[PDB]
Symmetry: C2
Subunit: 102 residues, 2 copies
């Protein structure tokens, strides 16, 4: 299980996304996978108070992907995506990346 | 920087469901920059590969060197992991984690 790509792309600066797409190299065992979203920075906020962002995860149209749908608006700021992917091998793989909302 | 001196439930202990989780540190906490999360990593009847986040709220302790985690849901018998973030006046985050079981 390896992350092939993501939308938003890592280290990118884009308009608030309607959803976050994570595309992996193998078919996901979604019941054992997951992801979380955190707002690590925002104008007017301290640099030491990261805010978790409520979100829901759903299986993608492509079985090698999953999508994160935020349950709250995404203010301009910096975000971190933490993910956990598991395939038929049943061996958890984790990773993370950051992107900015402008 | 703050160091975890003790906790209730204690690390690697088996206890009756706690009403709250108390984290005691060596230095006064800057609670606004601190925090913690609770995850149910195991439960009889559930898969071994599907950790479940447990909603909770964090409040400052009576003792300025402590903070309390109050779960927003019941805690069924099972295994739990506490992840914490503690910051003192030095303003440097220190993180750690420990596990305990509810029986």
């Amino acid at each position: 299980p390896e992350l092939k790509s993501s939308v938003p792309q890592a280290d990118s600066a884009v308009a608030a996304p309607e959803k976050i797409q994570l595309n992996f190299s193998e078919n996901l065992t979604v019941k054992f996978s997951g992801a979380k979203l955190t707002m690590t920075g925002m104008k007017g906020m301290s640099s030491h108070s990261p805010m978790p962002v409520a979100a829901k995860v759903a299986p993608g149209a492509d079985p090698k992907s999953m999508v994160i749908i935020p349950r709250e608006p995404l203010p301009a700021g910096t975000y971190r995506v933490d993910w956990r992917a598991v395939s038929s091998d049943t061996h958890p793989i984790t990773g993370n990346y950051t992107f900015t909302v402008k």
